[PDB]
Amino acid sequence: MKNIESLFDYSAGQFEFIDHLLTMGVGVHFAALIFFLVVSQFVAPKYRIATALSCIVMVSAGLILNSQAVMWTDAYAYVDGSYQLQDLTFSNGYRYVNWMATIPCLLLQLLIVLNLKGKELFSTATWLILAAWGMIITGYVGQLYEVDDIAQLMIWGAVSTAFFVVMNWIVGTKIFKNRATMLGGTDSTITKVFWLMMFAWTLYPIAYLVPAFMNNADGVVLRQLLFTIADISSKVIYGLMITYIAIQQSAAAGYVPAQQAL
Ligand SMILES: CCCCCCCC/C=C\CCCCCCCC(=O)OC[C@H](O)CO
Ligand SMILES: CCCCCCCC/C=C\CCCCCCCC(=O)OC[C@H](O)CO
Ligand SMILES: *C/C=C(C)/C=C/C=C(C)/C=C/C1=C(C)CCCC1(C)C
Ligand SMILES: CCCCCCCC/C=C\CCCCCCCC(=O)O
Ligand SMILES: CCCCCCCC/C=C\CCCCCCCC(=O)O
Ligand SMILES: [Br-]
Ligand SMILES: [Br-]
Ligand SMILES: [Br-]
Ligand SMILES: [Br-]
Ligand SMILES: [Br-]
């Protein structure tokens, strides 16, 4: 009842488009899961955790998207020409809770292919995860107010954005100070990964703000469309680039299975 999805009836076209976005998301992540599983054998031990983390992200995101899809069809029934709310079973909050797990995985696989190790890896991962969790938690509290108190959504969103900015500064600083350690030409690739991240992750706060500028049923559809673009870009496309970097550095480091695969 705290999310705008509960306020509207949906046309068949709107309802089925949202359902198809979510189900397509499930298929894309589980298809990618198999790809990451099969190619892990071509990654040197030093980097193989990075590809395993992509497997974990795929199933984590795939399970939440599948949960959202079933919750969506549980919550609404087609009555008198529109889909109308029947049960309080759908909310976006499950995405936020899941981010607590998937964002640390996405960040860790970046740090691994940057060749960080030992105390710097543990220290950098700790500050990044704390910053990320602060961002997620404040965002989560903010969206509890997207119906009742838009001013509170904005203020919690400003606090969240402060964590986001600091997180991105840590990430960017480590990338630009360590890309010279990267093998096989991937010092060039990692810069593109950073820009892909900036683009894809910024779509989430845009989705967060939809209630402020498009509080209607088409805004609900737009938000799910933005989440879909962002999810595929931040998890699947990002994971493919991380895996490419891992295999390329593995080969440059003399790992034979990587050399043959390329
Ligand atoms: C009264 C309400 C409370 C107000 C306060 C809440 C807002 C504070 C937010 C950010 C400050 C913390 C930023 C400090 C981060 C420094 C540590 C760090 O980033 O280390 C990175 C390094 O590159 C890795 O080794
Ligand atoms: C809540 C409202 C507050 C609004 C606040 C607006 C300030 C935005 C500024 C920067 C965004 C952070 C982007 C981080 C980009 C990476 C920066 C970086 O990596 O620095 C390069 C390094 O110094 C080379 O060695
Ligand atoms: C796969 C999911 C990912 C990469 C989720 C990323 C989420 C964010 C970057 C969220 C950022 C937010 C803000 C910067 C302010 C508004 C609240 C959030 C949590 C949506
Ligand atoms: C309060 C929350 C703090 C969370 C901190 C999490 C710390 C995680 C630290 C690094 C995990 C990396 C483990 C795998 C190392 C891979 C390196 C390698 O095998 O080449
Ligand atoms: C996620 C990015 C957050 C950006 C910070 C928000 C910037 C705030 C800008 C002006 C706030 C104006 C407050 C007006 C409250 C409207 C109350 C209402 O109409 O219900
Ligand atoms: Br229709
Ligand atoms: Br329509
Ligand atoms: Br190795
Ligand atoms: Br997720
Ligand atoms: Br490149």
Side-chain angles (χ1 to χ4, degrees):
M1 274 174 41
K2 301 198 157 196
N3 287 171
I4 65 171
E5 283 81 5
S6 68
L7 298 174
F8 309 108
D9 305 321
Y10 300 90
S11 73
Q14 293 169 326
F15 181 88
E16 289 166 13
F17 186 68
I18 286 170
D19 188 59
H20 293 339
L21 283 174
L22 293 167
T23 299
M24 182 199 68
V26 175
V28 167
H29 283 83
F30 276 95
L33 167 66
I34 307 298
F35 175 86
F36 292 122
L37 174 70
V38 168
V39 298
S40 59
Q41 67 190 293
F42 309 120
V43 181
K46 188 203 315 307
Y47 300 119
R48 203 175 291 147
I49 178 65
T51 47
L53 283 168
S54 275
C55 293
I56 293 170
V57 171
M58 293 307 104
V59 179
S60 183
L63 283 177
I64 291 286
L65 293 181
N66 188 69
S67 176
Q68 295 287 89
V70 182
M71 275 166 35
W72 184 246
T73 59
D74 278 351
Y76 292 85
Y78 194 72
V79 184
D80 291 342
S82 72
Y83 279 95
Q84 307 186 17
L85 186 59
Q86 308 297 136
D87 202 10
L88 300 314
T89 78
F90 186 86
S91 71
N92 296 293
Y94 301 99
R95 285 187 182 261
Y96 285 72
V97 178
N98 196 61
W99 295 343
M100 297 289 289
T102 55
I103 284 181
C105 293
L106 297 168
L107 291 170
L108 250 194
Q109 64 187 159
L110 176 70
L111 302 181
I112 289 162
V113 296
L114 266 179
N115 300 308
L116 301 191
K117 56 198 87 189
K119 188 56 190 172
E120 191 188 359
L121 175 60
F122 170 86
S123 174
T124 302
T126 299
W127 288 110
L128 279 175
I129 291 164
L130 287 175
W133 282 351
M135 179 186 72
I136 297 164
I137 291 172
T138 54
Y140 173 82
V141 176
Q143 56 87 45
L144 295 175
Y145 296 99
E146 69 179 31
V147 170
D148 298 323
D149 194 345
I150 285 285
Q152 255 204 86
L153 174 116
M154 297 299 220
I155 298 318
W156 283 108
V159 176
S160 184
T161 296
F163 284 100
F164 179 58
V165 166
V166 171
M167 183 193 74
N168 288 332
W169 170 78
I170 298 173
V171 168
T173 300
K174 293 304 188 195
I175 288 173
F176 287 111
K177 286 190 160 184
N178 285 278
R179 60 173 166 170
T181 75
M182 316 277 290
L183 316 177
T186 60
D187 56 307
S188 169
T189 318
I190 196 72
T191 303
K192 269 77 98 176
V193 168
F194 179 62
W195 286 108
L196 172 68
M197 289 183 75
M198 304 273 93
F199 159 76
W201 290 39
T202 301
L203 295 178
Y204 291 97
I206 295 167
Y208 174 92
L209 287 167
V210 163
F213 66 83
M214 196 180 279
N215 186 18
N216 55 51
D218 289 321
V220 170
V221 176
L222 176 59
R223 172 149 74 183
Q224 294 303 318
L225 181 60
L226 291 173
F227 280 150
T228 297
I229 295 164
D231 281 347
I232 290 167
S233 299
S234 71
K235 296 181 233 282
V236 181
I237 298 173
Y238 172 89
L240 289 173
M241 300 188 71
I242 295 296
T243 292
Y244 169 79
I245 292 169
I247 296 169
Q248 186 65 241
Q249 291 196 102
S250 295
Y255 190 63
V256 180
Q259 297 180 342
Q260 303 175 131
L262 289 167

